[PDB]
Every structure is written in structure tokens, then in C-alpha cells.
Design a protein around this nucleic acid. Structure first.
Ligand SMILES: [Mg+2]
Lengths: 415, 131, 294, 112, 34, 51
DNA sequence: TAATAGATTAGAGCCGTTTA
RNA sequence: AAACGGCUCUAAUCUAUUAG
């Protein structure tokens, strides 16, 4: 009695019948699709009788608009109704509705009471529904078939409507000095002097010194700048620059926010040399990483930052780049910097790349995010901020909490 | 908190008009859109290259498993998924026995003479390069 | 270094679909590192390797493995040699098929670092694309979805808008990778899932073309996925429609058999055929069909 | 569409259905009864459906105790519900309670 | 000339289909009209 | 006169196996001499033709 | 012509194969 | 070069500015 019967409209419903037939055969169920199992020669109607009455377990009739009026399928369905009455088994016939051009109000009376399994526009999810029904009614290899079984169900896995919160990479700039000052060091500042060597962030723009610091801060390394008139320096409020409302023939808007961006970058560079962290020269920017043994058990706030890998040492490091397009933010970038024993940097960069890839083989979202947050918190001076010395009286304030995002669609994390 | 909007993943057609997301599942379930009758492979390489290609083609014809089948689907075998013959016994083999230019020219002349002179029809030339 | 692309370029004159297979690829178990495991470890993805190889073979043999479900997505890439702009176009025909030819005849801007089209070259590119659409679908496209990895200058956009026919609203998209937005997930250990779109502006956004997948129960990208910046810097269109069309273009990667790739496939195929075209000497009226390139 | 349909239990409930049918033709209305008009040597269910959804102004359901549970009446009433939805005609379905045995609750939830 | 143009029409149709079209053709049956 | 020769010659550079089939060959029954039997009488040779 | 920055862009290599 | 990604490195260009 262990056999599945699939009646169908022969002239114009073959393809689905074959697909379902070989799919069910691959699933272990015994099928009797006529175009695939009807022996040549044999009395076909008598053989169909024998199959339906003697060994058919379930009857699958296709509800295509070409069917439900075909004589052959109607006769097999009438015999199926008789066997349903004899067996007294609920839902012995399991209709399948593949055609979308017929409605449920046009189905023939013999199967109108029974609920058609949905195959209208998705044969694989329809087959998953059909197999769910078969499991429900206990319809009648141990490694290969389970893969196909799981593939049928997993082909339509989607995003569950759940809310998820995300820690991003950008760190907002909570507060900043209100005024950007261009000092007039026409002759006090040496023309061949390097502005990047200044103890405080500044740039030589248009024979002015653009900086967030006071005019008298550049004294120890620039003694001749002393006794400078404050009226000569031209001051522009930072809020106007950030909002984009400030635009003058003196400085253009885009140049002004580019200048404050590079000022923030220079402030970061000159700050972390104080924050007890060594630097590594990447191709485009500097990455700041802490040496081994400088942290208690090499962890900060239950997150490790330097560890042992294959006789050598890895250190989690970050690189900063401020940008102001959506809002004043500092984009961070995560890296692994590699050392012989945590004290000596690796000169060869091919070994550095290989070791970075090896350490990133098994690191994932939780590890990356926790290490970035721990590093940012370790750089922090107070509880929720990082200080950058852009002025003896003015500081750049970098938030400790990155820009949190949220989403209405997400997934269930596999265990 | 900024709202991360969701873009639903589009579905790609397959055989019989069905739609799926992953090619590795849509092909295994339904198969490709149009039917070709088979692939007459042409191989331009060394004898060891031809043997390696033949062995891997025979391996392809039978299903091959990934180490973790859930994340990356299985391969049910070429004939199972595409319904097309790509057997290793129908190979048109052209044995080969500024250095970049000459190395290119070798395979180039082999393929050009094959496609021009020889009569056997080849649909895709599998240049099995050495290492 | 220049073997594969030069070989394809030489074979380009007489159309011969060729697939280059490394001997270490097919039999990776034989060749090792001389002190342990093989140099190329394909054990975990052997079925994936067969998937990709079979899909590429079936594609080059004249077969269409999968389609996509009046807009011409014209993605062009600039190559350094003089700069060469090489484009791939995609659209839907009358018979619901996805016409995914190329847009070849790389247009040469003589400026060294200007990845922009001169007015004549831009005119030629867009008129070629529109003529291909007109001959394929028997009518002009409603809206050409021009996209690139670079921002379009004023002059080339003016050339595009003056060569285009009427009732054809043309929109340009700049798609950039490696933009540093490493958005994580605080609760779970699994990354942000593919398909999330961060609308940072009415014209600019972050599209997560890759990430965690519920269906594969894993991540298309190792580590934390990197979103791709989608900027509608030129043309007038909705950001959500642009993101949806980018994710649609993210499916036509015939060169592989993978769920999805980090970038739209049109850009990637245009870049590949441009590398092929620039690998060797010029070819007049190149084949313009990816079976000969990928 | 101009016809009146009467569904009922076939073995037990024949006298009332036959009487009602014959009275209805006597009044002039057209009827289709499975024990009077269902011709021998036809596809009985196919013709039943064709008559339900091709020529039927009203569909009457005799509601005896056995008839309500009867599978044939259930199928006929199901397609009657479908055609009632299609034609939009109000009160197209008319039950007939003939037995004092079954109560209001005992009737199957469709025709209550 | 007329032979040249008539040949060229079927010709460039064939090269355009062999170069651009994705579908493979093993042999092109030019059904010459009468 | 030289349609077939020119067409086969111009396809030689880009190798393309081409077969020129006249309409009067494939469906010879439709074209008639306007007063009787078709201009090409292939009825006796159909299979051979197909061959 | 050289330099100092930021923003874009392009090129190549190099490693891992996507936590069950 | 089956392939896609993460990273690493390099170079160039466009602005503005300073020294030639
Ligand atoms: Mg390829």
C-alpha cells in the first residue's frame, strides 16, 4: 500500500508531473506517474485500477485548468474517491493547483471540498507544503536524501520581521571648538618650516596659519610667532562651516570643511602619540596599536586586544579618518598589526598580509565589533569621550558610542 | 538611531518559468532556461593536462559534496542540473609539447588551426594551462 | 601576468568561446606546498568549484543558466593603459529575456587621470547603446540606467543628455566599494544580513549587496561585510528603485555560480571585457558577448 | 440559469424531495433532482456540477439528519457556496429543515 | 552591387549574431528567398 | 548569379559553417509554375532530398 | 616644476573558502 | 586564469595652498 499516485492532464501537464515525480523518488517516496512508470504494452486502464486500488497510499491530482475536465484524470479521481470511501482515511486525495488561470470556484465537485495545495507560482515552496502534508499524514539514502530535503525547505528562507540594532563604525563628534582661526604669521612662521611638525594641528594655507588653537600656543617650537596681534587673525565659526552656510571669496565652503577634516586627522595623529600606543604606517593612513604586555592579561573591559598566534604576536589596531558629509563623524578602520613577540614590528609586509589574513580567518562580527569598541574605550580619557588637543583651551570631543543603526528586517542566528 | 531599510532579494528565473534566489538551488531544482544538446569540449594543453581534465570531467558527471552542504549547496552532477551531455570521451584534444606573447601564440595558433582546419565542431575550448 | 587577457584578445577577432583552466585548479590534490597541505585548498568548496566550472562551461557553450526578473542598465568602467572606457549593457527584451550583451569599442580619453568621457566619445557610447536597444526591443528605452565606478563630469553628462532621444530620462549611478562603514551587530555574532540599505541622502545611500544570508545560513563575505556606496549624483530617480535595480544587477554573474557578489555584475563584466580589450592591440568591431571574455 | 436545484440524501430522503419537485413542476418552475432528472448512463457528478453552475437560479438543501453529513450533499453545497459567491445573487442558497429531531446546533456550520 | 548588398545583409546578420548573441549556433541555414 | 559563392567567401575569415537552403527546395510544393506542377518536382526524391 | 593635505580613482598581489 | 570576497601595497589624477 506504500505508493504515491500522480494523476494529471497528459497532453499539456507533463513537465510538472515529471519534475514532481523524480523529486519525490529522490525523496524516497514511491511514485506512479503514468508517463514515467506505465509499462508499454500493458492494459493501461486495468493497470491504473490495480495501482489505485491495491497499493496507492495517496492520490495527487493536478488542478490545472486543462485538467478538472479531462476524462482520464476524472476517471482516476472517481476511483480515488471510491478508495477514499473504502479506506475511510482523511485527505487521501491531495489536489495540487499549479495553474493560476483558474480560480478555486471553478474546481470540479469531486475535489472542491478538499483544500488544494498551493503550486500556482512557486513549485519548490509548493513541494515543501506537499511534503509537510505528507509528514502530517505519515506518507511512506540516509545521508544523500536529507540534503535535498533540507534544500527544498531552505530555498525560500527569508528575512523575519524582527527589529535589530547595529553598532556601526562612525563615531560622532559630540562637540568641537566654536572658532577656526587663521593667524597672520606672514614673517614670524618660517617659510621652509614644516607645519606638520607643530605640536598642535595647523596648516599653512594662503600665507595664513589655519588652526583651532590660540595664536600664542605655537610658542615653544615657534618663538618668533610671539607678540602677534590678534586682530590680524581672521576667525570663522565652526558651526557655519559644518552647516555649509559660510561661503566667501576668502575661503570656499568645500575648502573650509576639507581644512577642518585634515585638522581633525592631524589632531588624532598628534593625540595618539600621547595615548600610549605605537603606530604602523599603512599605505594610506596610520594605524595605532598597543604593544603586548601593556594591558592586564592583554584585555580591556573583557575584550582582548593583543594575543599569540603561531609563535608571533597580533595586535588589534585602528586608523581614523574624519568626514563631515552626513554629519561630523570619525570613520574608524580595523587592522591586525603583527610582531615577533609583541614588542618588535614586522618589517616585511607580505608576512604582515599573510598573518593578517590568517588571524582574520576565524574572527567575526562579534569579535571585530567588541575589539573596536574596546580599543576606542581604551583610548578614551573620560567615560564617554576622547579628547584631541586642537587647542590649549579648545579640544575635539569624540564620542565613545558609535552611530547606532536599527532595522525592521533581520534573521534568526544559526546555533 | 538611523533606520536601515530593507531591499528584498530579487528572484531569478529558471526552467518552466519558476523563480528562485540562489543559482545553486534554482539550477538543481528546475534547471537552465534554454536547452543545448551537449558540449563538445576542445582541450588545448599537454597530455597531463588532458588527463587531468578528463579525470575532473568524470568527477563532475557524478554528484560531488561540499564539506558543509547547508551554506554552499551540493552539486548533483552536470547531467542532473543542466540536462546536457559534457562527457570526457568527446574531447577534441590539441597536444602541445615577449615570452608572454610566445606562450599566448602557442595556444592561439593551436586553436586557430583547430577551428579553421579541423572538421570536428567544438563549442568551447578548454585551455588547460600548466603551472 | 598578461597571459589570459592577451589570449582572449587575440582570439577575439575570430569568435571562439574559450575557457582557461589552471592545471592546479582541476587537480588540486596532486600539487602541494612541498611541506604539507596543497597550495590551493579546495576541499571545502569542491562542489562549489564544480558548480562554477559547469556554469561557465554551459554559458560558453551557448546556454542561458538563469535569467532576471524598459530600462537599459549601462555599466561602464575606466581602464588605465590614455584611459579606455568599456561598457556592458543589460535590459529586458519583448520575450521577457535578459539581453546581456556588451557595449564594446572602448572609448579613449587621452587625459592621463581623467576617468571621464569626452563629448564625442560619450556621444558615441550612448548612441551605440541606444541603437543596440532600438534594434533589440524595436523601440528606444524608457530610461537608461547608466552607472559607473566614477562620478560623471558636467560635460559628459551634457553630451549624454543631448544625444539621448525624447522621453528617455537618463540616470547615472556611481557605485564605490571600500567605503569605510563597518556596521556591526551588537547582539549576535553573525554580521549584518545582505539586503540592508542605508539611505544617507535622497540621492546617496549605502547598499549592502553582500552580508549574512538567512537562506545560506552564512555570510557571502568573510569578516564584516563592506557596503557599497550608491550615489545618484546625476539624473533624477528614486533611491529605493536604484537600490532594487542594483540588487537585480547583482544576480547576472554568469562567470561564477554564486549567490551574489559585492558589486553589480554589469560593472564587473564591463571591467573584465575592458581588461581583455586593452590586453592586446585594437580590434575593430569586437565580438561584444561575454562568452568570449569571461 | 433559469432552474431550481434540490440537493438531498439519496437513499433515505426521497419521498419529500420527489414530492417537492413534482409540485414545483406542477407550479411551472423548472427543477433538477438527482433521483428524477439525473439520467441513467451519464457522468452523474459532472452533470450535477454543470447544472449547479450553468442552469440554477436557486439551490435548495434538504436538511435531514443523515443528509447534512452526506458527502454528496456536502460537495454539492460546497460548489453551491462557490457559485453563490460568483453570481452575487442574494439568498441563492435555501435550506429546508424537515426533521424535528436535529436541533439548531446539530446542523453543520456551513448552512446554519 | 545588388549581389554585394544582398550578400552583405545576410552576412552582417550572421556576424552580428555570432559576435553579439549569447546563444550558440552550430550551423547557419540561410533560407534564401525566391 | 554569385550569391552563394560571395556569401561563402565573406564568411571565411570568421569561421562560420553556413548552409544556403533555397525556399524552392525546402517547401517546393507551394511554388508552382502558374500552370501546373511545381517548378521543382521533388516528390520522387523527397527522402533522398531529406537525406 | 617641487611640496602639504583631503577626495576620488585605478591598478595589481595575497589569503581564505564564509563560525554549523 | 572556476570564483567571490576580505585585506595589503602602489600609483595616478582633480581641488586648494605654499615653495619654483
Ligand atoms: Mg570567466
Amino acid at each position: 500500500r506504500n505508493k504515491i499516485f500522480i494523476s494529471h492532464a497528459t497532453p499539456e501537464d507533463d513537465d510538472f508531473t515529471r519534475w514532481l515525480s523524480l523529486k519525490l523518488i529522490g525523496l524516497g517516496y514511491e511514485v506512479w506517474c503514468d508517463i514515467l512508470f506505465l509499462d508499454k504494452g500493458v492494459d493501461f486502464w486495468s493497470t491504473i485500477e490495480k495501482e489505485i486500488r491495491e497499493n496507492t497510499c495517496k492520490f495527487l491530482i493536478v488542478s490545472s485548468t486543462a485538467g478538472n475536465k479531462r476524462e482520464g484524470v476524472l476517471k482516476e479521481l472517481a476511483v480515488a474517491t471510491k478508495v477514499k470511501k473504502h479506506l475511510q482515511d482523511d485527505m487521501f486525495i491531495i489536489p495540487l493547483a499549479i495553474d493560476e488561470n483558474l480560480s478555486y470556484d471553478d474546481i470540479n465537485i469531486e475535489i472542491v471540498r478538499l483544500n488544494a495545495i498551493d503550486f500556482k507560482k512557486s513549485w519548490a515552496k509548493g513541494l515543501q507544503d506537499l511534503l509537510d502534508a505528507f509528514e502530517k499524514q505519515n506518507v511512506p539514502d540516509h545521508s544523500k536524501s536529507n540534503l535535498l530535503y533540507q534544500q527544498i525547505f531552505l530555498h525560500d528562507k527569508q528575512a523575519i520581521e524582527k527589529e535589530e540594532t547595529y553598532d556601526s563604525n562612525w563615531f560622532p563628534i559630540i562637540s568641537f571648538p566654536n572658532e577656526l582661526r587663521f593667524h597672520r604669521y606672514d614673517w614670524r612662521l618660517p617659510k621652509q618650516f614644516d607645519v606638520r611638525t607643530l605640536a598642535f594641528p595647523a596648516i599653512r594655507y594662503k600665507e595664513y596659519l589655519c588652526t583651532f588653537a590660540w595664536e600664542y600656543d605655537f610658542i615653544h617650537q615657534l618663538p618668533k610667532t610671539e607678540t602677534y596681534n590678534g586682530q590680524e587673525s581672521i576667525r570663522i565659526s565652526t558651526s557655519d562651516i559644518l552647516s555649509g552656510r559660510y561661503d566667501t571669496d576668502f575661503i570656499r565652503n568645500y575648502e573650509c570643511q576639507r581644512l577642518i577634516v585634515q585638522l581633525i586627522n592631524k589632531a588624532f595623529e598628534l593625540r595618539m602619540k600621547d595615548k600610549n600606543v605605537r603606530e604602523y604606517q599603512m599605505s594610506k593612513t596610520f594605524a595605532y596599536w598597543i604593544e603586548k604586555g601593556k594591558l592586564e592579561k592583554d584585555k580591556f573591559e573583557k575584550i582582548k586586544l593583543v594575543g599569540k598566534q603561531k609563535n608571533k604576536y597580533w595586535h588589534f589596531g585602528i586608523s581614523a579618518a574624519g568626514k563631515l558629509y552626513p554629519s561630523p563623524v570619525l570613520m574608524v578602520s580595523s587592522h591586525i598589526i603583527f610582531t615577533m613577540d609583541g614588542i618588535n614590528l614586522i618589517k616585511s609586509k607580505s608576512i604582515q598580509h599573510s598573518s593578517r589574513r590568517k588571524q582574520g580567518k576565524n574572527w567575526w562580527n562579534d569579535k571585530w565589533r567588541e575589539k573596536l569598541l574596546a580599543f576606542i574605550r581604551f583610548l578614551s580619557d573620560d567615560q564617554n569621550a576622547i579628547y584631541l588637543n586642537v587647542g590649549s583651551e579648545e579640544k575635539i570631543l569624540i564620542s565613545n558610542k558609535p552611530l547606532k543603526f536599527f532595522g525592521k528586517m533581520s534573521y534568526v542566528t544559526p546555533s | 538611531m538611523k533606520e536601515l531599510i530593507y531591499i528584498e532579494e530579487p528572484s531569478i528565473l529558471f526552467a518552466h518559468g519558476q523563480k528562485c534566489t540562489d543559482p545553486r538551488d534554482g539550477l538543481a531544482l528546475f534547471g537552465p532556461l534554454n536547452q543545448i544538446y551537449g558540449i563538445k569540449s576542445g582541450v588545448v594543453g599537454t597530455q597531463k593536462g588532458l588527463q587531468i581534465f578528463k579525470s575532473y570531467l568524470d568527477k563532475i558527471q557524478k554528484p560531488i559534496y561540499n564539506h558543509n552542504n547547508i551554506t554552499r549547496p551540493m552539486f548533483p552532477g552536470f547531467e542532473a542540473v543542466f540536462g546536457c551531455k559534457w562527457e570526457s570521451q568527446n574531447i577534441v584534444f590539441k597536444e602541445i609539447t615577449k615570452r608572454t606573447y610566445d606562450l599566448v601564440t602557442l595556444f592561439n595558433d593551436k586553436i586557430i588551426t583547430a577551428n579553421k582546419n579541423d572538421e570536428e565542431r567544438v563549442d568551447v575550448w578548454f585551455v588547460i594551462v600548466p603551472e | 601576468a598578461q597571459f589570459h587577457d592577451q589570449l582572449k584578445a587575440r582570439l577575439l577577432e575570430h569568435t571562439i568561446p574559450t575557457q582557461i583552466l589552471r592545471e592546479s585548479t582541476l587537480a588540486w590534490r596532486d600539487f602541494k606546498n612541498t611541506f604539507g597541505a596543497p597550495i590551493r585548498d579546495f576541499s571545502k568548496i569542491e562542489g562549489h568549484l564544480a558548480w562554477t566550472i559547469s556554469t561557465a562551461a554551459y554559458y560558453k557553450a551557448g546556454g542561458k543558466p538563469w535569467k532576471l526578473g524598459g530600462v537599459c542598465y549601462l555599466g561602464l568602467v575606466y581602464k588605465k593603459i590614455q584611459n579606455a572606457c568599456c561598457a556592458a549593457q543589460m535590459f529586458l527584451d519583448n520575450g521577457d529575456g535578459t539581453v546581456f550583451k556588451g557595449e564594446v569599442g572602448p572609448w579613449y580619453n587621452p587625459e592621463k587621470g581623467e576617468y571621464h568621457l569626452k563629448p564625442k566619445e560619450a556621444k558615441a557610447l550612448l548612441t551605440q547603446a541606444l541603437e543596440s536597444y532600438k534594434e533589440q526591443n524595436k523601440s528606444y528605452p524608457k530610461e537608461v540606467f547608466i552607472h559607473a565606478r566614477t562620478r560623471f563630469n558636467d560635460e559628459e553628462w551634457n553630451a549624454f543628455n543631448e544625444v539621448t532621444p525624447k522621453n528617455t530620462n537618463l540616470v547615472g549611478v556611481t557605485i564605490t566599494k571600500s567605503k569605510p562603514l563597518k556596521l556591526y551587530k551588537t547582539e549576535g555574532a553573525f554580521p549584518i544580513m545582505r539586503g540592508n540599505a542605508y539611505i544617507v541622502d535622497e540621492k546617496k545611500a549605502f547598499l549592502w549587496t553582500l552580508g549574512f544570508v538567512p537562506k545560506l545560513q552564512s555570510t557571502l563575505s568573510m569578516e564584516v561585510p563592506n557596503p557599497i556606496f550608491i550615489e545618484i549624483n546625476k539624473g533624477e530617480a528614486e533611491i529605493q528603485q536604484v537600490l532594487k535595480d542594483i540588487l537585480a544587477l547583482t544576480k547576472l554573474n554568469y562567470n561564477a555560480c554564486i549567490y551574489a557578489d559585492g558589486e553589480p555584475v554589469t560593472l564587473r563584466f564591463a571591467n573584465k571585457i575592458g581588461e581583455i580589450l586593452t590586453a592586446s592591440t585594437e580590434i575593430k568591431t569586437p565580438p561584444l558577448a561575454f562568452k568570449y571574455y569571461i
